[PDB]
Amino acid sequence: NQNAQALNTLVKQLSSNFGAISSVLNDILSRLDPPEAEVQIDRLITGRL
Amino acid sequence: PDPSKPSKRSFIEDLLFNKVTLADAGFIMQYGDCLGDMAYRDLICAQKFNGLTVLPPLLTDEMIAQYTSALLAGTITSGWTFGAGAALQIPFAMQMA
Amino acid sequence: QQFGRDIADTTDAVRDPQTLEILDITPCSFGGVSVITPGTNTSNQVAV
Amino acid sequence: PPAYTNSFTRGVYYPDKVFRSSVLHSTQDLFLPFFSNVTWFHAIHVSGT
């Protein structure tokens, strides 16, 4: 049960915003320009790491 | 192990598996060969939507059961002699003595 | 119902706007490679 | 005066069109509280006294 709960929590954490405009990289790229989105992408990567 | 059953699984393991809440909607053919006493949906590929691969264990349950049966048979027949060297047959009634 | 979800928080069931049908979603491989190599002194053949 | 009465469990609706099965889902949205007190109105044909 603990292993399953940890795996499930790790899976749902992928959808965490971490203070960004959106939790999906594709949405960020489409709505927002790449160069300014670099900070948001870096923050999301840091949170996931 | 029961010689008649195709799978060499002891009665205790069968009861342990049975004591968990299972489902009756359909046919009980295999219903979980590795799960820890439950019956679930499709294999890890069903749950792997982000590449969360689950590497199969090196040792299979059949091998673990064979090891347990061999150790139990050695204990009944060879007693503790096989663990300290070559197996030495001896009646069980004389082992408890 | 139009869209579907799953415990993985990823779309699983969808509805085709053209015709009323249900199409499931599942990945094929996602990729994973292992290499088996014996002792290089004897031979260098490898298995994928 | 207003007549208060127990509010039955009726009044639930799907938050969205998402499909789920055999999974409990939490949702924080404007819903009807269960077993809440509700005021029931009255209807009469003769009045004026």
PDB file of C-alpha atoms in Angstrom:
ATOM      1  CA  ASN A   1       0.000   0.000   0.000  1.00  0.00           C
ATOM      2  CA  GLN A   2       2.816   2.419   0.837  1.00  0.00           C
ATOM      3  CA  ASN A   3       4.603   1.703  -2.448  1.00  0.00           C
ATOM      4  CA  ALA A   4       1.394   2.143  -4.447  1.00  0.00           C
ATOM      5  CA  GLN A   5       0.548   5.384  -2.633  1.00  0.00           C
ATOM      6  CA  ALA A   6       4.038   6.767  -3.255  1.00  0.00           C
ATOM      7  CA  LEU A   7       3.901   5.877  -6.958  1.00  0.00           C
ATOM      8  CA  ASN A   8       0.430   7.390  -7.335  1.00  0.00           C
ATOM      9  CA  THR A   9       1.481  10.578  -5.535  1.00  0.00           C
ATOM     10  CA  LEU A  10       4.544  10.871  -7.766  1.00  0.00           C
ATOM     11  CA  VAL A  11       2.269  10.458 -10.795  1.00  0.00           C
ATOM     12  CA  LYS A  12      -0.169  13.171  -9.696  1.00  0.00           C
ATOM     13  CA  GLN A  13       2.720  15.509  -8.873  1.00  0.00           C
ATOM     14  CA  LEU A  14       3.322  15.788 -12.628  1.00  0.00           C
ATOM     15  CA  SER A  15       0.213  18.000 -12.798  1.00  0.00           C
ATOM     16  CA  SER A  16       1.432  20.343 -10.034  1.00  0.00           C
ATOM     17  CA  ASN A  17       1.700  23.955 -11.164  1.00  0.00           C
ATOM     18  CA  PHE A  18       4.686  24.965  -8.989  1.00  0.00           C
ATOM     19  CA  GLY A  19       3.646  28.593  -9.432  1.00  0.00           C
ATOM     20  CA  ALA A  20       3.787  28.543 -13.236  1.00  0.00           C
ATOM     21  CA  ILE A  21       1.133  29.839 -15.616  1.00  0.00           C
ATOM     22  CA  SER A  22       0.216  26.254 -16.550  1.00  0.00           C
ATOM     23  CA  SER A  23       1.162  22.700 -15.604  1.00  0.00           C
ATOM     24  CA  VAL A  24       1.564  21.548 -19.239  1.00  0.00           C
ATOM     25  CA  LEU A  25       4.681  22.416 -21.230  1.00  0.00           C
ATOM     26  CA  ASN A  26       2.827  22.369 -24.557  1.00  0.00           C
ATOM     27  CA  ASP A  27       0.243  24.877 -23.306  1.00  0.00           C
ATOM     28  CA  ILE A  28       3.019  27.171 -22.063  1.00  0.00           C
ATOM     29  CA  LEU A  29       4.821  27.011 -25.409  1.00  0.00           C
ATOM     30  CA  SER A  30       1.638  27.604 -27.414  1.00  0.00           C
ATOM     31  CA  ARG A  31       0.236  30.474 -25.342  1.00  0.00           C
ATOM     32  CA  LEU A  32       3.566  31.973 -24.220  1.00  0.00           C
ATOM     33  CA  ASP A  33       6.738  32.636 -26.179  1.00  0.00           C
ATOM     34  CA  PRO A  34       9.700  30.269 -25.633  1.00  0.00           C
ATOM     35  CA  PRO A  35      12.361  32.746 -24.465  1.00  0.00           C
ATOM     36  CA  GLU A  36      10.323  34.237 -21.607  1.00  0.00           C
ATOM     37  CA  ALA A  37       8.876  30.820 -20.743  1.00  0.00           C
ATOM     38  CA  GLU A  38      12.414  29.620 -19.986  1.00  0.00           C
ATOM     39  CA  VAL A  39      12.138  30.712 -16.349  1.00  0.00           C
ATOM     40  CA  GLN A  40       8.832  28.876 -15.876  1.00  0.00           C
ATOM     41  CA  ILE A  41      10.220  25.733 -17.515  1.00  0.00           C
ATOM     42  CA  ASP A  42      13.322  25.881 -15.308  1.00  0.00           C
ATOM     43  CA  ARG A  43      11.197  26.258 -12.175  1.00  0.00           C
ATOM     44  CA  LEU A  44       8.971  23.337 -13.191  1.00  0.00           C
ATOM     45  CA  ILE A  45      12.016  21.161 -13.900  1.00  0.00           C
ATOM     46  CA  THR A  46      13.530  22.104 -10.536  1.00  0.00           C
ATOM     47  CA  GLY A  47      10.312  21.206  -8.732  1.00  0.00           C
ATOM     48  CA  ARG A  48      10.040  17.876 -10.533  1.00  0.00           C
ATOM     49  CA  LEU A  49      13.691  17.124  -9.752  1.00  0.00           C
TER      50      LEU A  49
ATOM     51  CA  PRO B   1       2.581 -29.273  -2.399  1.00  0.00           C
ATOM     52  CA  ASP B   2      -0.376 -31.103  -3.917  1.00  0.00           C
ATOM     53  CA  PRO B   3       0.858 -33.398  -6.730  1.00  0.00           C
ATOM     54  CA  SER B   4      -2.565 -33.378  -8.417  1.00  0.00           C
ATOM     55  CA  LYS B   5      -2.768 -29.602  -8.869  1.00  0.00           C
ATOM     56  CA  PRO B   6      -0.771 -28.426 -11.917  1.00  0.00           C
ATOM     57  CA  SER B   7       0.715 -25.572  -9.860  1.00  0.00           C
ATOM     58  CA  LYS B   8       2.981 -26.604  -6.972  1.00  0.00           C
ATOM     59  CA  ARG B   9       1.420 -24.249  -4.427  1.00  0.00           C
ATOM     60  CA  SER B  10       0.781 -25.296  -0.840  1.00  0.00           C
ATOM     61  CA  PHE B  11      -2.689 -25.264   0.696  1.00  0.00           C
ATOM     62  CA  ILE B  12      -1.671 -22.474   3.080  1.00  0.00           C
ATOM     63  CA  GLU B  13      -0.819 -20.143   0.193  1.00  0.00           C
ATOM     64  CA  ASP B  14      -4.121 -20.992  -1.497  1.00  0.00           C
ATOM     65  CA  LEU B  15      -6.052 -20.083   1.657  1.00  0.00           C
ATOM     66  CA  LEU B  16      -4.025 -16.882   2.045  1.00  0.00           C
ATOM     67  CA  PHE B  17      -4.943 -15.882  -1.508  1.00  0.00           C
ATOM     68  CA  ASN B  18      -8.603 -16.861  -0.998  1.00  0.00           C
ATOM     69  CA  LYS B  19      -9.017 -14.900   2.264  1.00  0.00           C
ATOM     70  CA  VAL B  20      -8.801 -11.594   0.308  1.00  0.00           C
ATOM     71  CA  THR B  21     -11.878  -9.955  -1.198  1.00  0.00           C
ATOM     72  CA  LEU B  22     -12.122 -11.114  -4.830  1.00  0.00           C
ATOM     73  CA  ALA B  23     -14.744 -10.654  -7.576  1.00  0.00           C
ATOM     74  CA  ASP B  24     -17.340 -13.109  -9.034  1.00  0.00           C
ATOM     75  CA  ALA B  25     -18.206 -11.164 -12.222  1.00  0.00           C
ATOM     76  CA  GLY B  26     -16.761 -13.499 -14.835  1.00  0.00           C
ATOM     77  CA  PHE B  27     -14.440 -16.542 -14.917  1.00  0.00           C
ATOM     78  CA  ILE B  28     -11.619 -17.088 -12.397  1.00  0.00           C
ATOM     79  CA  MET B  29      -8.895 -18.457 -14.665  1.00  0.00           C
ATOM     80  CA  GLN B  30      -5.571 -16.991 -13.487  1.00  0.00           C
ATOM     81  CA  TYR B  31      -6.615 -13.828 -11.451  1.00  0.00           C
ATOM     82  CA  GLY B  32      -3.238 -12.531 -10.281  1.00  0.00           C
ATOM     83  CA  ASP B  33       0.033 -14.458 -10.552  1.00  0.00           C
ATOM     84  CA  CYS B  34       2.313 -11.970  -8.749  1.00  0.00           C
ATOM     85  CA  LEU B  35       0.178  -9.483  -6.817  1.00  0.00           C
ATOM     86  CA  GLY B  36       0.266  -9.539  -3.029  1.00  0.00           C
ATOM     87  CA  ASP B  37      -3.047 -11.537  -2.573  1.00  0.00           C
ATOM     88  CA  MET B  38      -5.369  -9.462  -4.826  1.00  0.00           C
ATOM     89  CA  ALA B  39      -6.844  -9.512  -8.393  1.00  0.00           C
ATOM     90  CA  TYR B  40      -6.563  -6.339 -10.473  1.00  0.00           C
ATOM     91  CA  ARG B  41      -6.881  -5.012 -14.036  1.00  0.00           C
ATOM     92  CA  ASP B  42      -4.399  -5.339 -16.975  1.00  0.00           C
ATOM     93  CA  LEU B  43      -0.587  -5.609 -16.693  1.00  0.00           C
ATOM     94  CA  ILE B  44       1.889  -2.837 -15.877  1.00  0.00           C
ATOM     95  CA  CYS B  45       1.628  -1.576 -19.460  1.00  0.00           C
ATOM     96  CA  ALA B  46      -1.959  -0.502 -18.599  1.00  0.00           C
ATOM     97  CA  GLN B  47      -0.614   1.616 -15.677  1.00  0.00           C
ATOM     98  CA  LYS B  48       2.490   2.738 -17.625  1.00  0.00           C
ATOM     99  CA  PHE B  49       1.396   6.011 -19.219  1.00  0.00           C
ATOM    100  CA  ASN B  50       4.662   7.858 -18.281  1.00  0.00           C
ATOM    101  CA  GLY B  51       7.119   4.977 -18.623  1.00  0.00           C
ATOM    102  CA  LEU B  52       6.901   3.886 -14.972  1.00  0.00           C
ATOM    103  CA  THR B  53       8.317   0.502 -15.919  1.00  0.00           C
ATOM    104  CA  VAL B  54       8.236  -2.245 -13.284  1.00  0.00           C
ATOM    105  CA  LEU B  55      11.143  -4.624 -13.822  1.00  0.00           C
ATOM    106  CA  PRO B  56      10.047  -8.237 -13.218  1.00  0.00           C
ATOM    107  CA  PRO B  57      11.626  -9.968 -10.212  1.00  0.00           C
ATOM    108  CA  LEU B  58      14.590 -12.196 -10.998  1.00  0.00           C
ATOM    109  CA  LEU B  59      13.104 -15.023  -8.923  1.00  0.00           C
ATOM    110  CA  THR B  60       9.659 -16.348  -9.824  1.00  0.00           C
ATOM    111  CA  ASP B  61       7.091 -17.521  -7.287  1.00  0.00           C
ATOM    112  CA  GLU B  62       7.397 -21.085  -8.605  1.00  0.00           C
ATOM    113  CA  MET B  63      11.125 -21.085  -7.829  1.00  0.00           C
ATOM    114  CA  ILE B  64      10.489 -19.734  -4.320  1.00  0.00           C
ATOM    115  CA  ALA B  65       7.906 -22.470  -3.756  1.00  0.00           C
ATOM    116  CA  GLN B  66      10.344 -25.109  -5.032  1.00  0.00           C
ATOM    117  CA  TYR B  67      13.041 -23.822  -2.663  1.00  0.00           C
ATOM    118  CA  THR B  68      10.594 -23.903   0.252  1.00  0.00           C
ATOM    119  CA  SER B  69       9.475 -27.449  -0.619  1.00  0.00           C
ATOM    120  CA  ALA B  70      13.090 -28.625  -0.920  1.00  0.00           C
ATOM    121  CA  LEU B  71      14.023 -27.115   2.446  1.00  0.00           C
ATOM    122  CA  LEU B  72      10.933 -28.627   4.077  1.00  0.00           C
ATOM    123  CA  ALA B  73      11.666 -32.070   2.589  1.00  0.00           C
ATOM    124  CA  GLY B  74      15.287 -31.894   3.740  1.00  0.00           C
ATOM    125  CA  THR B  75      14.137 -30.979   7.236  1.00  0.00           C
ATOM    126  CA  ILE B  76      11.685 -33.898   7.345  1.00  0.00           C
ATOM    127  CA  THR B  77      14.132 -36.414   5.870  1.00  0.00           C
ATOM    128  CA  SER B  78      17.647 -35.023   6.382  1.00  0.00           C
ATOM    129  CA  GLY B  79      16.880 -32.997   9.506  1.00  0.00           C
ATOM    130  CA  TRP B  80      19.556 -30.394  10.160  1.00  0.00           C
ATOM    131  CA  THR B  81      22.369 -32.512   8.682  1.00  0.00           C
ATOM    132  CA  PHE B  82      21.919 -31.158   5.141  1.00  0.00           C
ATOM    133  CA  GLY B  83      22.494 -27.571   6.291  1.00  0.00           C
ATOM    134  CA  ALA B  84      25.782 -28.562   7.931  1.00  0.00           C
ATOM    135  CA  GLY B  85      26.982 -30.757   5.064  1.00  0.00           C
ATOM    136  CA  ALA B  86      25.820 -33.795   3.135  1.00  0.00           C
ATOM    137  CA  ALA B  87      22.224 -34.802   3.791  1.00  0.00           C
ATOM    138  CA  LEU B  88      21.769 -37.742   6.173  1.00  0.00           C
ATOM    139  CA  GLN B  89      18.434 -39.551   6.012  1.00  0.00           C
ATOM    140  CA  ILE B  90      16.779 -40.319   9.351  1.00  0.00           C
ATOM    141  CA  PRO B  91      13.178 -41.140  10.387  1.00  0.00           C
ATOM    142  CA  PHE B  92      11.130 -38.127  11.451  1.00  0.00           C
ATOM    143  CA  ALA B  93      10.062 -39.899  14.642  1.00  0.00           C
ATOM    144  CA  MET B  94      13.769 -40.104  15.555  1.00  0.00           C
ATOM    145  CA  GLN B  95      14.356 -36.422  14.707  1.00  0.00           C
ATOM    146  CA  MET B  96      12.086 -35.134  17.480  1.00  0.00           C
ATOM    147  CA  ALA B  97      13.897 -37.418  19.935  1.00  0.00           C
TER     148      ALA B  97
ATOM    149  CA  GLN C   1     -19.893  12.337 -21.279  1.00  0.00           C
ATOM    150  CA  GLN C   2     -17.243  13.753 -23.623  1.00  0.00           C
ATOM    151  CA  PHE C   3     -13.810  13.074 -22.093  1.00  0.00           C
ATOM    152  CA  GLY C   4     -12.380  10.448 -19.764  1.00  0.00           C
ATOM    153  CA  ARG C   5      -9.644  10.377 -17.147  1.00  0.00           C
ATOM    154  CA  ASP C   6      -7.697   7.748 -15.210  1.00  0.00           C
ATOM    155  CA  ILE C   7      -5.784   7.263 -11.966  1.00  0.00           C
ATOM    156  CA  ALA C   8      -2.712   8.379 -13.932  1.00  0.00           C
ATOM    157  CA  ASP C   9      -4.335  11.816 -14.470  1.00  0.00           C
ATOM    158  CA  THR C  10      -4.076  11.271 -18.226  1.00  0.00           C
ATOM    159  CA  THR C  11      -6.851  11.027 -20.804  1.00  0.00           C
ATOM    160  CA  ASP C  12      -7.986   7.423 -21.312  1.00  0.00           C
ATOM    161  CA  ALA C  13     -11.486   7.522 -22.843  1.00  0.00           C
ATOM    162  CA  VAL C  14     -12.488   9.952 -25.598  1.00  0.00           C
ATOM    163  CA  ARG C  15     -15.516  10.371 -27.859  1.00  0.00           C
ATOM    164  CA  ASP C  16     -15.287  10.880 -31.612  1.00  0.00           C
ATOM    165  CA  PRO C  17     -17.297  13.991 -32.606  1.00  0.00           C
ATOM    166  CA  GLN C  18     -18.116  12.481 -36.008  1.00  0.00           C
ATOM    167  CA  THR C  19     -19.715   9.227 -34.817  1.00  0.00           C
ATOM    168  CA  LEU C  20     -20.716   8.009 -31.353  1.00  0.00           C
ATOM    169  CA  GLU C  21     -17.832   5.686 -30.489  1.00  0.00           C
ATOM    170  CA  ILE C  22     -15.348   5.116 -27.672  1.00  0.00           C
ATOM    171  CA  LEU C  23     -11.624   4.916 -28.457  1.00  0.00           C
ATOM    172  CA  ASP C  24      -9.196   3.824 -25.744  1.00  0.00           C
ATOM    173  CA  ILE C  25      -5.738   5.331 -25.205  1.00  0.00           C
ATOM    174  CA  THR C  26      -2.645   3.266 -24.454  1.00  0.00           C
ATOM    175  CA  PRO C  27       1.079   3.695 -25.234  1.00  0.00           C
ATOM    176  CA  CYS C  28       2.948   1.103 -27.274  1.00  0.00           C
ATOM    177  CA  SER C  29       6.492   0.825 -25.897  1.00  0.00           C
ATOM    178  CA  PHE C  30       7.842   4.020 -24.282  1.00  0.00           C
ATOM    179  CA  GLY C  31      11.259   2.496 -24.973  1.00  0.00           C
ATOM    180  CA  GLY C  32      13.735   0.482 -22.939  1.00  0.00           C
ATOM    181  CA  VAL C  33      16.968  -1.232 -23.996  1.00  0.00           C
ATOM    182  CA  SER C  34      19.287  -3.620 -22.156  1.00  0.00           C
ATOM    183  CA  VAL C  35      22.613  -4.962 -23.428  1.00  0.00           C
ATOM    184  CA  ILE C  36      24.066  -8.330 -22.414  1.00  0.00           C
ATOM    185  CA  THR C  37      27.829  -8.674 -22.873  1.00  0.00           C
ATOM    186  CA  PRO C  38      30.027 -11.626 -21.848  1.00  0.00           C
ATOM    187  CA  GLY C  39      33.679 -11.358 -20.926  1.00  0.00           C
ATOM    188  CA  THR C  40      35.515  -9.247 -23.493  1.00  0.00           C
ATOM    189  CA  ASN C  41      38.603 -11.468 -23.221  1.00  0.00           C
ATOM    190  CA  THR C  42      36.743 -14.470 -24.654  1.00  0.00           C
ATOM    191  CA  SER C  43      34.353 -12.817 -27.131  1.00  0.00           C
ATOM    192  CA  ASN C  44      32.847  -9.417 -27.915  1.00  0.00           C
ATOM    193  CA  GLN C  45      29.422 -10.487 -29.244  1.00  0.00           C
ATOM    194  CA  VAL C  46      26.525  -8.733 -27.504  1.00  0.00           C
ATOM    195  CA  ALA C  47      22.780  -9.310 -27.191  1.00  0.00           C
ATOM    196  CA  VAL C  48      20.071  -6.641 -27.256  1.00  0.00           C
TER     197      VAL C  48
ATOM    198  CA  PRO D   1     -42.860  31.927  10.612  1.00  0.00           C
ATOM    199  CA  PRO D   2     -40.504  29.917   8.377  1.00  0.00           C
ATOM    200  CA  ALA D   3     -40.763  26.134   8.726  1.00  0.00           C
ATOM    201  CA  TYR D   4     -37.353  24.462   8.794  1.00  0.00           C
ATOM    202  CA  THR D   5     -36.977  20.842   7.702  1.00  0.00           C
ATOM    203  CA  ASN D   6     -34.180  18.352   7.031  1.00  0.00           C
ATOM    204  CA  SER D   7     -32.762  18.475   3.501  1.00  0.00           C
ATOM    205  CA  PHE D   8     -32.532  15.033   1.885  1.00  0.00           C
ATOM    206  CA  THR D   9     -29.405  13.907   0.008  1.00  0.00           C
ATOM    207  CA  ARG D  10     -30.999  14.933  -3.309  1.00  0.00           C
ATOM    208  CA  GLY D  11     -29.226  17.725  -5.156  1.00  0.00           C
ATOM    209  CA  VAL D  12     -25.922  16.251  -6.386  1.00  0.00           C
ATOM    210  CA  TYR D  13     -24.534  16.800  -9.876  1.00  0.00           C
ATOM    211  CA  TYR D  14     -21.414  15.895 -11.827  1.00  0.00           C
ATOM    212  CA  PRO D  15     -18.754  18.645 -11.544  1.00  0.00           C
ATOM    213  CA  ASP D  16     -17.737  18.004 -15.172  1.00  0.00           C
ATOM    214  CA  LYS D  17     -17.975  15.449 -17.989  1.00  0.00           C
ATOM    215  CA  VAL D  18     -14.917  13.478 -16.847  1.00  0.00           C
ATOM    216  CA  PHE D  19     -15.460   9.712 -16.703  1.00  0.00           C
ATOM    217  CA  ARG D  20     -14.397   7.692 -13.664  1.00  0.00           C
ATOM    218  CA  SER D  21     -15.113   4.261 -12.218  1.00  0.00           C
ATOM    219  CA  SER D  22     -14.373   2.580  -8.880  1.00  0.00           C
ATOM    220  CA  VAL D  23     -12.357   5.628  -7.766  1.00  0.00           C
ATOM    221  CA  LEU D  24     -13.349   8.149  -5.102  1.00  0.00           C
ATOM    222  CA  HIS D  25     -13.010  11.740  -6.332  1.00  0.00           C
ATOM    223  CA  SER D  26     -13.008  14.868  -4.184  1.00  0.00           C
ATOM    224  CA  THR D  27     -14.487  18.088  -5.539  1.00  0.00           C
ATOM    225  CA  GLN D  28     -14.572  21.541  -3.925  1.00  0.00           C
ATOM    226  CA  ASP D  29     -17.351  23.472  -5.663  1.00  0.00           C
ATOM    227  CA  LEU D  30     -20.713  25.066  -4.938  1.00  0.00           C
ATOM    228  CA  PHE D  31     -22.798  22.040  -3.942  1.00  0.00           C
ATOM    229  CA  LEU D  32     -25.839  21.376  -1.758  1.00  0.00           C
ATOM    230  CA  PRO D  33     -24.836  20.455   1.821  1.00  0.00           C
ATOM    231  CA  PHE D  34     -26.277  17.167   3.029  1.00  0.00           C
ATOM    232  CA  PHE D  35     -28.786  17.084   5.897  1.00  0.00           C
ATOM    233  CA  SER D  36     -28.935  20.890   5.950  1.00  0.00           C
ATOM    234  CA  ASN D  37     -31.934  22.849   7.197  1.00  0.00           C
ATOM    235  CA  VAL D  38     -34.210  24.217   4.465  1.00  0.00           C
ATOM    236  CA  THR D  39     -37.205  26.539   4.835  1.00  0.00           C
ATOM    237  CA  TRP D  40     -40.406  25.190   3.273  1.00  0.00           C
ATOM    238  CA  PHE D  41     -43.009  27.582   1.872  1.00  0.00           C
ATOM    239  CA  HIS D  42     -46.798  27.356   2.144  1.00  0.00           C
ATOM    240  CA  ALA D  43     -49.615  27.654  -0.392  1.00  0.00           C
ATOM    241  CA  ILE D  44     -53.190  28.703   0.406  1.00  0.00           C
ATOM    242  CA  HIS D  45     -56.204  29.625  -1.718  1.00  0.00           C
ATOM    243  CA  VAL D  46     -58.252  31.577   0.879  1.00  0.00           C
ATOM    244  CA  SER D  47     -56.614  34.480   2.714  1.00  0.00           C
ATOM    245  CA  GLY D  48     -57.289  38.010   3.946  1.00  0.00           C
ATOM    246  CA  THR D  49     -57.798  37.447   7.685  1.00  0.00           C
TER     247      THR D  49
END
